[PDB]
Design a protein around this ligand. Structure first.
Ligand code: ZN
Ligand code: ZN
Ligand code: ZN
Lengths: 77, 816, 110, 107, 63, 441, 81
């Protein structure tokens, strides 16, 4: 259970993990944020979207980082 | 009165002094926020007498200076009226033979004058630079260094200009000059933003009448050079001349220090300057080559290294100019007798060798191989060894190399300490003589052998060592008589009983047998190895290491010369080296089991290993299981897998677990190679994953882990899928070892099978009705997520969107 | 197939200006050869940028039955010391390796 | 390489086995077709005429006469849901666009 | 109490099976999910792999 | 099956670039990054032809690339932040023509995660520290000191773990031998996920903030937040220290802003648009890429805009403050993944889709019958301008690229025997169908 | 119990009782990579100690090749404090 002190330290360590009660909302929103961080990181899906819509890389990443805030609806209750 | 009260509540420095770390947290936090409201008014009078209390300890000081610095950051203004008090009570600390008193006073005064006012400082400590006492001048000067740390030189530099241009007092000019050298000590690199401003400050006193100021300014040149080395290719001609003249028209510690400082000026200069400047300073150097002084020796020799080590000065210059007085006055016993001079004289003399060759330096230090202070000839071979080892033996001519080899022999006999000094000297010197050494191999060996005959152990051991050094070149002679000598004479000393010599003898024999192969060894290995077998019982780490090394060489190469029956007996003896207390022995034992499996076939050694698995006590069971893995790796695994698998049926625990652990190591050793025996082994693991016991499933899971990490990337994913079907049910488990080996199997299986398959296994129980099952699935999915969170982006399901959220990902189903 | 009489191939053309081919193997001798070539190359000549090669090529789902011609073809630009070490593990000469490297592009592509 | 331009993003294409002749379908998001391009240009010139002040100050001609090549000058194409297309019939061996079908507004 | 209110907050297995779009999945383990609409959408996703049998059982895995 | 994987033509498209004297000389080298590739080119000043010296594989993703010079050395190291949990330090050996790994620091797990650093990375303008940063919850800082032999060292890293915070950019602010410090953007999705109404979605403000070193006390202290008016993408650094003031140009939508902490009253300027354009009444405008020419004489920025238009920016400054801003229309070139503005009078315009260009600078972008714009010029209305063909820049070089290769077809569709490749490539108006063949023209 | 406050560049060491095993896997074999610890479990009287015994730092804690295959060696100072 000191293992648990370390393990909810691990929950505090890695944003996106889970535990047996985790809610569909936390799960899917964390995966959605991660999806955004990687669309930004990988230099080429950025071209994919930039080219799919008719936007430009500054436009693209600005949208993405705005969306990063409430990507999957408002919260659960 | 509120002021006395504020001090009253302020003495929760007791809360911080005594108490829990809880107490520390309460008080530390409250005051770190109250540092304004409480103020420094009461603090400082509570605070100074503890910081001056005679035995406040290292970390008490550390914590209280933590306090003073952060509360002074906090209260830039709310510490104001206590400045001269803090100042004069801490001042002697920067000028203080405790480097950390210097450091800590320096840091807190940095922060003090920093969040404080410069005015007060200047006001108080102007009239003390002119003072009469060198004591107070040094204290205030190193204070001023700390205050420049606290604030910054710029705000001060004109007042420095004043305290250094004073025509009232020389006391104050000396004071400003040592302030200069002091910052030059403290801030270090941080000076190049000025880099000449201080040089201007100092140009006034190297010509001065008071030797005190003159020579402390020389040392200021030294200190500025020191902090002012490497970077600083710009502005420097504007002061070159006072340095130049004071060098000679001066006398002192400052001059030697200045020679190191102008060593920084010899690297940073150009021909028409670095020819005139060097050529001029060399005659200074020749008069200083007899300087008794230690830091003199350091500075002048460092200087010389860079100075007579440039491309401005031709070999002729040094060889006729520096060398005679240099060799004359530093190649007296005194320098090798000295603890500093030994090594540093080395440094610069090796560099002058690098400069001008060996056929003069070697000649100048030949007969120092026959002096009195054994430390001396010890030094001279230390040098010569470094020298020829870096440079080569091509430069040394005939008579030179002779006197060298001979002084070498002497040093080594004369030896009276247990040191690698003379050993390494010898090794290097012949390592560089290369092929030059042919004609003295009778001499060299005859010496070593007569030593090998001595009564006292120590010299015997030494001669064994020296053989182990020169072993390889003993070859390059092609000394029939002589390498034959060393062969048979070491076969003699194989009877020693000082483990420290016996080990080295074994080393030297091994390093002979490496050059000269088996079938022309001087003792035929047909008599060597029979002599070696009774040594394997010597229960000592070094002799055991070297003996098993030598027997491993022989059994590898000689193989057929020894008989199968001999190898079998030696197997039976190895079986109980697996209990030595040292791990090097046990790893060597396993390796030789491998070699014996190569020489003789695998089957008998494997039979003798299973019977050992039947033993108890774990650390020799585990090392035989390593050995089984090794035999299987060398002689292909199909030879051993049937016997292992079949032995998995003897109904005992320690042995079923031995089989499982051995397959673990085998797939790790095989790695990709397991791509062959994965099929053979699956139906046995599925057999033991359908229950037989806790330990049965714990061990089959470990086997799955290692198979998966070995077969990563070779396509045997259908088999690991099949075994997932059987491992995954154990997911709900409780015993720590069992569930832990299960989780390990699933990380291995995650890389080997991919993260789709395992996310699908983990889908349905994320949101399931029980909390035991929710928790295990979130444990797994956490570990699947941490590693390989980025594949999953293409593996997540499709999760429909209800009313007030959006949950589908339309990004991914744009058509194109 | 690209060059005349060259055996069949898979051309793949990416979205960043990359074009390449995946080419079968005809003999476990070829197969095992490059298999070992790169199995050593990963160990003694890892990528520059911190990564592991096995894990980069098994980013999403693990690797299965593809050898990294672009790691293999790096033996050329390696250093003589390592060129030795590895080709000696193969106990072929750096000539043997490098020619067996070049020719496999020779019979498929250019 | 040798490169024969297009003006809308290329989506896909198919082959004509008879004449070696290449039918490309090209299409873009966030763009007006040729028609609406010119039409809202001249229409903005109209609403531009209406400053009611000297009537005299005439820029509309220069509007309809300028054509700044989007190939360097970026594409005067905007909106959000605004699509544009083309089918083109070209020769691979030389870049003649032997036919051009240029479609409707949002198709 | 809180447990009684959320137990009554829980629904009928027929409530579920009629609500849901894919009714094959529904079991009382789901009817006992603190989020049964999720739990059932998950269990009805493609390619996913259901919990082992034996979490209910009192006997351990292969005893 | 058993397959062997071969790449015939490397990836050509460019994503990142840096410019520096990567061979110690004052001939400048350019280090660009393809997808999983680090490629180094040196532009010859004589013809104006860029020779692609060194093209290397890295087997990873280059997420971040930034060169730096040590305080006074003559070399130009590279700091690469990629998708492993490591920061790596690189150098050129022209003697072996090879990139060399000086140091290597692990700090976490692999893959393009979300809370593990590596997406953003900045330095301090002098070369004293680097910061590595994620898009949530994590940033570290590394200190760099020459060793005695001046062979670089790197000590353990610092920390700035702050939960529930995005980052739209991080950049080093130019201080003069003070503690170095960094300007990040930020945001805080926290409340907007505590509010069941979606109110806090709106009404949340970027916070242009500064963290600061304390090399003496060896930690990073949060100095200066300031709630910004509106989210803007990034922050161009103002050449401080001795030259220039300090401060950041916040490139927000429609508005570019000077700002620095202390006494400065914050400076605005709306963006001048092209006139009579055909763009949607809604469409905003953002500054895409930038590049700064800071020289003996002075400094200036170029920033580019969606329709490809480049602008010039210099600082009209009094004693310690700047006073007002002048953005004056330079020219319009392809949309850029990066600009690398050389000395020797060129600039590298790294195209984003298609052939990427090398222009040479002809006129400083000053003193002609193009208008003047300003942060002091008040107005009720905007500015405009009317663009034109290349005035201040002259197209020296044109490097080909397939990025993007939107479709292909192998065939033998000339009478030749060997097959050609028909590559449908390029974006929008700059697209094309292009013929590849194995021959050389 | 673990320190786990993140890694660094300071090597760890082993007492002679603890000589030979990996830090977690508890192996005795095939060690591949060296161990690194945090500054906080690096300082002071804890300089050069046994991550396991607490005994004097003499031999170098290492990482069993399994632990490096599964990258359980990329978490930092695992000191049982
Ligand atoms: Zn381990
Ligand atoms: Zn620790
Ligand atoms: Zn221990």
């Amino acid at each position: 259970y000191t293992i648990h002190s370390q393990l909810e330290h691990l929950q505090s360590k890695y944003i996106g993990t889970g535990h047996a009660d985790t809610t569909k909302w936390e799960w899917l929103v964390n995966q959605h944020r991660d999806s955004y961080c990687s669309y930004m990181g990988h230099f080429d899906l950025l071209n994919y979207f930039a080219i799919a819509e008719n936007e430009s890389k500054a436009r693209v990443r600005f949208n993405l980082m705005e969306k990063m805030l409430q990507p999957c609806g408002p919260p659960a209750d | 009165p509120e002021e006395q009260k504020e001090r009253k509540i302020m003495k929760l420095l007791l809360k911080i002094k005594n108490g829990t770390p809880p107490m520390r947290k309460a008080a530390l936090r409250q005051i770190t926020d109250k540092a304004r409201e409480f103020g420094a008014g009461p603090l400082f009078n509570q605070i100074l007498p503890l910081l001056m209390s005679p035995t406040l300890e290292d970390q008490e000081r550390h914590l209280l200076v933590k306090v003073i610095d952060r509360i002074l950051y906090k209260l830039d203004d709310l510490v104001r009226p206590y400045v001269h008090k803090i100042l004069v009570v801490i001042e002697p600390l920067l000028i203080d033979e405790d480097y950390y008193a210097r450091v800590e006073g320096r840091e807190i005064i940095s922060n003090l004058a920093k969040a404080a006012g410069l005015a007060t400082m200047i006001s108080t400590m102007r009239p003390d630079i002119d003072n009469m006492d060198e004591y107070v001048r040094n204290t205030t000067a190193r204070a001023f260094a700390v205050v420049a740390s606290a604030l910054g030189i710029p705000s001060l530099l004109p007042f420095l200009k004043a305290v250094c241009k004073s025509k009232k007092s020389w006391q104050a000019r000396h004071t400003g000059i040592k302030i200069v050298q002091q910052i030059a000590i403290l801030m270090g690199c941080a000076i190049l933003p000025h880099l000449r401003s201080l040089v201007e400050i100092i140009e006034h006193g190297l010509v001065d009448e008071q030797q005190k100021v003159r020579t402390i300014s020389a040392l200021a040149i030294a200190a500025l050079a020191e902090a002012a080395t490497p970077y600083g290719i710009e502005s420097f001609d504007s002061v070159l001349k006072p340095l130049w003249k004071g060098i000679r028209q001066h006398r002192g510690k400052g001059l030697a220090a200045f020679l190191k400082a102008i060593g920084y000026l010899i690297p940073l200069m150009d021909a028409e300057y670095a020819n005139y400047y060097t050529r001029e300073v060399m005659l200074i150097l020749i008069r200083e080559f007899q300087s008794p002084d230690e830091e003199m020796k350091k500075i002048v020799l460092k200087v010389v290294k860079q100075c007579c080590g440039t491309d401005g000065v031709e070999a002729n210059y040094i060889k006729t100019e520096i060398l005679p007085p240099f060799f004359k006055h530093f190649w007296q016993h005194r320098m090798a007798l000295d603890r500093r001079n030994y090594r540093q004289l080395v440094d610069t003399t090796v560099e002058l060798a690098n400069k001008v060759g060996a056929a003069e330096i070697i000649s100048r230090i030949v007969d120092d191989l026959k002096d009195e202070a054994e430390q001396y000839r010890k030094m001279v071979m230390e040098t010569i060894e470094k020298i020829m080892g870096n440079l080569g033996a091509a430069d040394i001519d005939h008579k030179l190399e002779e006197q060298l080899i001979d002084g070498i022999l002497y040093a080594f006999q004369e030896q009276t300490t247990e040191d690698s000094v003379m050993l390494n000297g010898f090794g290097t010197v012949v390592n560089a003589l290369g092929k030059r050494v042919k004609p003295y191999l009778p001499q060299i060996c005859g010496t070593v052998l007569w030593r090998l005959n001595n009564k006292s152990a120590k010299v015997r051991q030494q001669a064994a060592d020296l053989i182990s050094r020169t072993a390889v070149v003993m070859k390059t002679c092609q000394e029939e008589k002589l390498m034959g000598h060393l062969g048979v004479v070491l076969y003699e000393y194989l009877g020693e009983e000082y483990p420290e010599v016996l080990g080295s003898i074994l080393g030297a024999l091994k390093a002979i047998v490496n050059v000269i192969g088996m079938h022309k060894m001087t003792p035929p290995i047909k008599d060597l190895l029979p002599r070696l077998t009774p040594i394997l019982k010597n229960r000592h780490e070094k002799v055991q290491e070297n003996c098993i090394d030598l027997v491993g060489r022989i059994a590898d190469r000689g193989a057929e010369y020894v008989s199968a029956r001999e190898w079998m007996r030696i197997c039976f003896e190895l079986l109980e080296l697996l209990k030595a207390h040292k791990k090097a022995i046990r790893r060597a034992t396993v390796n030789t089991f491998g070699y014996i499996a190569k020489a003789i076939g695998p089957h008998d050694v494997l039979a003798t290993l299973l019977n050992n698995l039947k033993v108890q006590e774990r650390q020799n069971r585990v090392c035989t299981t390593v050995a089984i893995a090794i035999v299987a790796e060398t002689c292909s695994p199909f030879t051993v897998l049937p016997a292992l698998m079949n032995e998995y049926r003897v109904p005992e625990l320690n042995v079923q677990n031995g089989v499982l652990k051995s397959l673990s190591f085998l797939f790790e050793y095989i790695g990709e190679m397991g791509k062959d025996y994965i099929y053979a082994v699956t139906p046995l693991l599925e057999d033991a994953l359908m229950d037989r016991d806790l330990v049965h499933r714990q061990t089959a899971s470990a086997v799955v882990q290692h198979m998966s990490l070995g077969v990563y990337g070779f396509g045997c994913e259908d088999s690991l899928n099949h075994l997932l079907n059987y491992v995954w049910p154990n997911v709900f488990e409780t015993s720590p070892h069992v569930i832990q080996a299960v989780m390990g199997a699933l990380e291995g299986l995650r890389v080997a099978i991919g993260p789709c398959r395992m996310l699908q296994y983990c889908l349905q129980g994320l949101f399931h009705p029980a909390r035991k099952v929710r928790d295990v699935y979130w444990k797994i999915y956490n570990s699947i997520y941490i590693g390989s969170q980025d594949a999953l982006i293409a593996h997540y399901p499709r999760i429909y969107n209800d009313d007030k959220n959006t949950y589908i990902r339309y990004e991914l189903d744009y058509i194109l | 197939t690209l060059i005349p009489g060259g055996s069949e191939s898979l051309v793949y053309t990416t979205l960043s200006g990359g074009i390449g081919i995946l080419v079968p193997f005809t003999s476990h001798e070829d197969h095992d050869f490059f298999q070992h070539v790169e199995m050593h190359l990963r160990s003694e000549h890892p990528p520059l940028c911190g990564r592991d090669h096995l894990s980069f090529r098994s980013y999403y789902f693990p690797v299965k039955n593809v050898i990294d011609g672009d790691l293999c073809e790096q033996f050329n630009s390696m250093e003589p010391n390592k060129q030795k070490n590895v080709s000696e593990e193969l106990d072929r000469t750096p000539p043997e390796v490098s020619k067996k490297l070049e020719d496999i592009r020779t019979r498929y592509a250019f | 390489q040798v490169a024969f331009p297009l003006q809308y993003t290329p989506r896909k294409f198919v082959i004509h086995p008879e004449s070696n002749n290449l039918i490309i379908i090209e299409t873009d998001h966030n763009a007006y077709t040729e028609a609406t391009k010119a039409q809202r240009k001249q229409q903005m010139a109209e609403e531009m005429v209406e400053a009611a002040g000297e009537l005299a100050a005439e820029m509309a001609a220069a509007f309809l006469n300028e054509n700044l090549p989007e190939s360097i000058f970026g594409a005067p194409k905007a909106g959000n849901g605004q699509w544009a297309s083309v089918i083109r019939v070209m020769n691979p061996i030389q870049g003649n666009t032997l036919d051009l079908v240029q479609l409707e507004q949002n198709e | 109490s809180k447990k009684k209110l959320r137990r009554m907050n829980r629904f009928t297995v027929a409530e579920l099976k009629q609500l849901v779009a894919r009714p094959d999945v529904v079991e009382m383990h789901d009817v006992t999910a603190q989020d049964p609409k999720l739990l059932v959408h998950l269990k009805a996703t493609r390619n996913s792999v259901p919990v082992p049998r034996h979490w209910c059982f009192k006997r351990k895995y292969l005893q | 099956m058993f397959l062997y994987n071969l790449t015939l033509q490397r990836a050509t498209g460019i994503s990142f670039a840096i410019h520096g004297n990567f061979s110690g000389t004052k001939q400048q080298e350019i280090v660009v990054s393809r997808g999983k590739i680090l490629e180094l080119l040196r532009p010859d000043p004589n013809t104006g032809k860029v020779h692609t010296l060194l093209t290397v594989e890295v087997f990873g993703v280059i997420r971040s690339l930034m060169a730096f010079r040590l305080t006074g050395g003559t070399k130009d190291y590279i700091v690469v932040g990629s998708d492993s949990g490591r920061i790596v330090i690189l150098e050129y050996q022209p003697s072996k023509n090879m990139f060399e790994k000086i140091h290597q620091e692990t700090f976490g797990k692999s893959g393009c995660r979300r809370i593990v650093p590596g997406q953003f990375l900045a330095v301090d303008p002098k070369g004293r520290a680097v910061m590595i940063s994620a898009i949530e919850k994590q940033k570290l800082v590394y200190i760099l000191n020459r060793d005695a032999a001046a062979r670089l060292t790197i000590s353990s890293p610092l920390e700035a773990h702050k939960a529930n915070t995005l980052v739209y950019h991080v950049v080093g602010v130019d201080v003069g031998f003070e503690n170095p410090m960094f300007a990040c953007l930020e945001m805080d999705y926290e409340e907007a996920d505590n509010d069941p109404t979606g109110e806090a979605a709106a009404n949340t403000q970027q916070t242009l903030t500064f963290y600061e070193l304390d090399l003496g006390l060896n930690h990073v202290v949060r100095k200066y937040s300031e709630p910004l008016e509106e989210h803007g993408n990034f922050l161009i650094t103002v050449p401080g220290g001795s030259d220039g003031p300090s401060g950041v140009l916040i490139c927000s939508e429609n508005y570019i802003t000077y700002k620095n902490f202390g006494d400065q009253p914050d400076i605005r300027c709306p963006i001048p648009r092209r006139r009579n354009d055909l763009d949607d009444p809604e469409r905003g405008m953002i500054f895409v890429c930038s590049a700064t020419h800071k020289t003996k004489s002075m400094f200036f920025f170029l920033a580019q805009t969606e329709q490809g238009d480049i602008f010039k920016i210099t600082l009209e400054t009094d004693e310690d403050m700047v006073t007002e801003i002048r953005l004056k229309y330079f020219d319009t070139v392809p949309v850029a993944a990066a600009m690398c503005v050389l000395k020797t009078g060129f600039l590298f315009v790294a195209s984003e889709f298609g052939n990427h260009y090398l222009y040479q600078i002809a006129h400083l972008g000053d003193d002609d019958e193009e208008p003047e714009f300003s942060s002091a010029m008040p107005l009720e209305d905007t500015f405009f301008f009317q663009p034109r063909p290349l005035k201040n820049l002259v197209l020296v070089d044109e490097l080909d690229s397939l990025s993007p290769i939107l479709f292909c077809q192998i065939a033998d569709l000339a009478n030749e025997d060997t097959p050609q490749l028909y590559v449908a490539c390029g974006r929008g108006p700059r697209s094309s169908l292009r013929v590849l063949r194995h021959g050389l023209e | 119990i673990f320190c786990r406050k993140q890694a660094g560049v300071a090597i760890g060491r082993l007492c002679e009782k603890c000589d030979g095993k990996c830090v977690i896997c508890d192996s005795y074999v095939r060690p591949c990579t060296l161990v690194r610890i945090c500054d906080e479990c690096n300082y002071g009287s804890y300089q050069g100690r046994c991550v396991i015994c607490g005994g004097p730092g003499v031999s170098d804690a290492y990482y069993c090749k399994e632990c490096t295959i599964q990258e359980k060696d990329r978490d930092g100072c695992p000191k049982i404090v």
